[PDB]
Design a protein around this ligand. Sequence first.
Ligand code: M9G
Ligand code: M9G
Ligand code: M9G
Lengths: 223, 222, 223, 215, 215, 219, 218, 216
Amino acid sequence: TTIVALKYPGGVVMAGDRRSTQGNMISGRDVRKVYITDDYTATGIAGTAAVAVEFARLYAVELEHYEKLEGVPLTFAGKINRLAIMVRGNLAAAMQGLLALPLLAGYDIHASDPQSAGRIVSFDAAGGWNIEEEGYQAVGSGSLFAKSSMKKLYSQVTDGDSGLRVAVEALYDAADDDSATGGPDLVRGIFPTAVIIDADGAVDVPESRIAELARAIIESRSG
Amino acid sequence: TTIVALKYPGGVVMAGDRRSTQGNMISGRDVRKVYITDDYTATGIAGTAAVAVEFARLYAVELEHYEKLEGVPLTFAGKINRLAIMVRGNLAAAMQGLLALPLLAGYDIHASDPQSAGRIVSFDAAGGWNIEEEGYQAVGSGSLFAKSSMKKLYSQVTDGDSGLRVAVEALYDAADDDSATGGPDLVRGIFPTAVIIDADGAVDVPESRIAELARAIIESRS
Amino acid sequence: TTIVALKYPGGVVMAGDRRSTQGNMISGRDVRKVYITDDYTATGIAGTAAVAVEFARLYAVELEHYEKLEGVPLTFAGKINRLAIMVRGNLAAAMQGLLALPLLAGYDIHASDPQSAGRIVSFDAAGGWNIEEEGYQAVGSGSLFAKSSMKKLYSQVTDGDSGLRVAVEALYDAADDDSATGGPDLVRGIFPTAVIIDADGAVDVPESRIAELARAIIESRSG
Amino acid sequence: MEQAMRERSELARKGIARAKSVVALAYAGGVLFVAENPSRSLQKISELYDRVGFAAAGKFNEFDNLRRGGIQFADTRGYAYDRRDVTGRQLANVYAQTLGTIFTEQAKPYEVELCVAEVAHYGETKRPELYRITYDGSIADEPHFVVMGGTTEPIANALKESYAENASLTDALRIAVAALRALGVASLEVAVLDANRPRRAFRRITGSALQALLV
Amino acid sequence: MEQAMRERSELARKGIARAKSVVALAYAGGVLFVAENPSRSLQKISELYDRVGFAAAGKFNEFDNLRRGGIQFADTRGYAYDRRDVTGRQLANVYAQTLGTIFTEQAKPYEVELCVAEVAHYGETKRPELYRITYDGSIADEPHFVVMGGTTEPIANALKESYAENASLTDALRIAVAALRAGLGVASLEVAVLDANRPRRAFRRITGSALQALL
Amino acid sequence: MEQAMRERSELARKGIARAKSVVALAYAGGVLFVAENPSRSLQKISELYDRVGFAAAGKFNEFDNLRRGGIQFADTRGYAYDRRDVTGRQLANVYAQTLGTIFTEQAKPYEVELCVAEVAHYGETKRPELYRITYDGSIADEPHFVVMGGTTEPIANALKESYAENASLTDALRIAVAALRAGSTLGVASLEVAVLDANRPRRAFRRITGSALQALLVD
Amino acid sequence: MEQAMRERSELARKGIARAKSVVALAYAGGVLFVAENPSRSLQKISELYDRVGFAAAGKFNEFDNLRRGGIQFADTRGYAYDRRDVTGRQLANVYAQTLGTIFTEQAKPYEVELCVAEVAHYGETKRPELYRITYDGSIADEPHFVVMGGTTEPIANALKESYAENASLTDALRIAVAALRAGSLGVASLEVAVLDANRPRRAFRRITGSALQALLVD
Amino acid sequence: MEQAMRERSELARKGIARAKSVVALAYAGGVLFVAENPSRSLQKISELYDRVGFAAAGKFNEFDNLRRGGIQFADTRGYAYDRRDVTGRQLANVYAQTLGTIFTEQAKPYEVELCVAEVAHYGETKRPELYRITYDGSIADEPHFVVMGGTTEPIANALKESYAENASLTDALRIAVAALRAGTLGVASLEVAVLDANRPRRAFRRITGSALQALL
Ligand SMILES: Cc1cc(C(=O)N[C@@H](CC(=O)N2CCC[C@@H]2c2ccccc2)C(=O)N[C@@H](C)c2ncc(-c3ccccc3F)[nH]2)no1
Ligand SMILES: Cc1cc(C(=O)N[C@@H](CC(=O)N2CCC[C@@H]2c2ccccc2)C(=O)N[C@@H](C)c2ncc(-c3ccccc3F)[nH]2)no1
Ligand SMILES: Cc1cc(C(=O)N[C@@H](CC(=O)N2CCC[C@@H]2c2ccccc2)C(=O)N[C@@H](C)c2ncc(-c3ccccc3F)[nH]2)no1
């Protein structure tokens, strides 16, 4: 699994691959690993599928629960805190193999400067969290290849289009060097999923757009 | 053990073998593993027998429990979530050896297109689940052989009877390569079981049709 | 220990040997291993003597308890369920050395066909149960000798007499190949025990009958 | 003591007296439940188990609590033993015990009157059973019909002078609706325990089908 | 204190007086229970243990409670030691204690009157035992018969006149239905016997054509 | 006992009598809640679930307790099963049960009157549902409008006279507010207004405040 | 407060008054228990421990509860220490405490009157001990006899005038029977037991049927 | 039931009518808390959270209990989530629920009346909020000020004709003291504090001693 998130002027993008493995066997070709968890927040997870789904559903239910009880959404710091608590509560199960790490992307509507309101938070199994202040981040088995690709590609990010482009290319390098990360399937027509967030909110990137970027990347690598 | 399920235009079909072993010894020739869990849902199980029977009985009782308490059946996502929660509940016993995984097949009466209302959901030991969108799936010690046969034989699925024939042939191959999966016993007259679910519900496939399909397969491979 | 049970037209018969060992020492010569649990069901157990006695007593008490409370006996399926739940209850102590498996033989007064109303139900340490549909079953350290003997002797079963005889002979073969199963003791007069169950209920077979059948088997194998 | 029981009995009796009426009858095809119910989504009649049905009159939340407790009892008992070990007499008994306890120990006694019915299993010939449990936990077995809630005397007498065993479905519906008026689709809830069904006997009769059955 | 206990004793007395009457007599074959019961499904006479039987009068849910409690106590006692150690005197004793606690401490005292009978085991020669336990936990030892529920005086008097030891089953049955008549066929009676002639379980029910034949 | 239950019923009834009125209407776009509320931050109407809304009249702390309990029930049921297995009828049912227990067992009965409303999921055809739950657990299904709080018979009789199915949002608002005042000068400073909008894809609850509410009221 | 205790003391006292009489009598062989009892199997007299016996008047289930409690206390103490540490004074003491708590705090007081008796261990010379514990926990040390239940004045005066310490079993028996008759009688309506100081360990012994009939007539 | 609830209600009402009076006002720099307090160390106005403060009238130990409860709630919630998630609306809600519960179930109802005020965070523009909760959990929202305790209507009148929005602190305290008199007050007889919206983190601040003397 590889999940990528990166900031661009006025928003943040997050994309993820579609592969599920069980040892070396391919147990999944169309897994959706990036969830819109509220109108301005999206969580993408890596690890045991059961813990990932429980994390996504329980987290979204928790956030909307708070804003329905109190008539106002949580601050972004509060969202980070609750997610960290949820990750920490799973530590015992994680030591026994049921390990899953999430990655947080969001748009803080209460931020002073809306151009840099984009937010990326990474987490570890201990609940420790870090707000990333260098632009991009990635979690999963191919996360090192992805971060190292984005280290060279990040200077190209100037808006949402270039941000999504760089994201899908980082996933491409992730699948290029990590057999547990799935690349574009031009035969079945399966591509990574993406969510983009700006001041208008969080939306799922349509399949055909990510397919366009993937084709451009492939033909670029073939020449 | 091998349970198979595949989608056909207008419904879904599931079939399972009859074998029980214990190490190498044959301890069962007539085990019925595909259950009609509700009017539009059938569950096949592979693994420890006690965990399997508990899963099927408790699961059907749970679905009907909700249906009678709230006057309406669960949505299909609800059924999936409940089953996955139960399988997750058995994770400690699973770690100590009492392992059993289900495969789900149902007809969603609230699906958009009635032809594509078939549903196949695979599960793992931690309650993770995947809705299979490639048409077929299998679980058990012979599931790889049955899936690799259905990969080549799925193109011949055009209606109910053809999908049932492909399911029986997949089980035949699984039994051909996995000594824990039982094949057709032509001497005793014991054949795999199968349930089919369409817009009119989930019905047991009569044994005679399974026997005829099996005889056609055997005759064709001789 | 070897316990056998088999169906015959209109009923069912169960029999068990009389041996108790610990290590290689004979510690018992007249153990009763087959119990009449209610008017139409008997259970024979193999394993730790304490767990076996507890199973049989507690099970008979359970059935008669339900019957007196609700004014009607449990359906045969319900009886199977309670027995299995009891075994699953003992699973842990079985994992630490107190293992004991039961074999259930009964007559279903509510069955559709009164001459095929005999029932053979086998169990395992985890509470799994299987209604046998091949005519015979056995449980114990000589169960495979007795089951393979019944595989050849079963076609001769046509009433209570024949079925009882092939039960005594299956026990004889088991005791012949398994030193933990006791054969007939002609010096002491101790012979295996048996229960027979028809539509008139479950009755114990007198020892002198099993002695007659035993001598018949012995001389039939002398010449 | 005697004052408190006087006030509990009277409170429950008046509360049931103010509620609408429900009738259950044995007919040739099983058991018929007919209840005066103007509501669209709220039910006075419910399935309990395979061949066992439930009807109730009085305060909705209370007999709905009891109805859910009955479903829990039947499902748990079936799973513990077997589906064919669950009887209507069992549910009647546990309803009598539970209702007695509620009547003596709860803050306010339940203002409910309950009926448990049971038809035969598919392919078996046994006659239906009708059980009536009152607010104080008193239980009684009726052979023909059960009237609950409201002014019971005119409905009871009407059935006594009109009831015939093994009546057809339409005859049972007309005799029941006639007995109640002592009433169309939008003001009636009707369901049957149909002994002709293989697995689950309970089924509602609503809408155009009920209209065709009415006239 | 005197106010409460007065009200409770008279509430239970009134409750028992309003219920139908039960009679139990020792005859040559064991013990005979006969109870006025128009129900086809609900039972006032039950089996407790191999040679121990139960007969109640009053409010059904309450003495069915005490009935299941007695069956529980009996089965548990027999499992902790042996079946043979369970005596009718034990059941009567714990019934006296139970009804004492209930009468003084429950929300409403139980409107019941219990009777526990014991016949001998098969090979043994032991005269029957009849115990009568009242709503306040009072326990009485009776050698010939026990009457419960309703207006007991005419029944106890008719029995005091017409009872002889070692009567046959039909004599005992007829004098019993006669004593009940002083304050009744198969359709309105429930009849059972603890038959000392049975090897294991003495309790047996006389119903249908057999009960009609005995009248 | 009987006297105690009588004076409990009277305490609750009189408490709701002195309370400001709330009404809920079925209309073309879904359901509309309008409530007499001079407050700025203390709300009487709230979102329950995706397509389920909530209205309340009476003592604020009590129906706010019930509001939170309803959100808890809905969210927990949705996590245990699916979001689509949560129905308005369920919330109304458990509200009847909870208000029954509260009415008979709490130290003081709840001086509250509740309404639960449900519209159709996006793209589906279903006429809205409206349920009224009384302080004693009494539940009732009503097809068009629900009035709670204060002197209700004038307001309800007004809606009986001026209700039209599938009326525009403007029409339903004017009819609702007209009936409100008819039961007893109001405006944006005295109204809390929201809708269950059957056109929104996911969350149907939507507040109409400020300039938009002013534009809707007067035309 | 004040009315509650008045109705409690009155309820318990009157409850004991309506019950049958029980007499416990120190005699040359030990202690003698005679009680009016029509029942064949329901008992008002019982063994407690080796040399300690129990008698009670009143409501059966209640003094039977106290009986079983006393046996439980005796057996538990004798197990925790030694049998030689269980004494009649201990049993009477825990009965005073227990009955005090019952009278003060039970939903209804116990309508019972208890006597605990102790003779000497075998081979030893110790005069018997009789303790009376009433419904409110009042404990009293009585020298020769104890009367409980019914109208105790006639029986108490009869025994006060006809008592002999060193009387035989037959003599003391017919004395107690004569006093019970004076307070209002054969085998079919009497329960009779004895704390026999001559038995080696368990002094308690019942006197039934033909043996008691032989003790009633010469 | 009803007469018992009115006995409780009146017990609390008479209790509060006998206690000293408290006023909390909105001014251009935040919120002002003025209370007649003869004590030197016992407080009727206190800090709850960064921008949320608390004033109380009635029996001391009871509104002190409630004050500690609100501090506990605020700190616990700010820890579970964020510090910005704590709002005066939330504390007024919890205080309402708590006082309703105490009024309906406690052995004796609390003879208290509370005010929870919140001002804007540093650098944010947002008009102050004032909430008033009474002995039975009744909650009311007030845009300008809250008067509670003792004979109230006299103080309320003076405020009705003396209040001016965006008044200076030096004007606002003088006005408040004037309203308190109607119903001579000096530093030795008063306790005063402010929610100073100009403060970056914690807005609550006591105005004591020589600084209060200079202010008056
Ligand atoms: C213990 C234990 C571990 C596992 C295990 O490794 N189970 C595998 C998954 C697996 O074999 N099966 C077969 C039946 C359904 C289930 C499936 C398949 C496909 C998709 C989603 C669930 C896993 O955990 N595989 C890992 C690599 C994985 N698969 C998907 C994710 C995932 C990650 C982030 C967000 C969402 C996700 F689904 N992770 N099972 O028990
Ligand atoms: C721990 C532990 C493991 C086991 C174990 O190996 N238990 C075995 C089963 C076994 O030895 N016995 C003998 C008595 C009844 C039971 C039986 C036999 C035959 C058929 C059905 C039940 C098993 O689990 N054997 C596996 C291969 C198996 N047998 C059936 C299934 C099964 C699978 C799917 C749906 C329903 C089913 F019953 N699975 N026991 O304890
Ligand atoms: C823990 C632990 C286990 C054991 C153990 O193995 N204990 C042995 C039994 C044993 O040593 N003793 C000595 C005193 C009575 C008891 C006995 C002897 C002979 C017969 C019946 C009871 C056993 O369990 N030995 C096994 C082979 C056995 N002995 C009888 C059965 C038996 C089987 C089925 C139905 C009834 C039965 F009694 N099983 N001891 O401690």
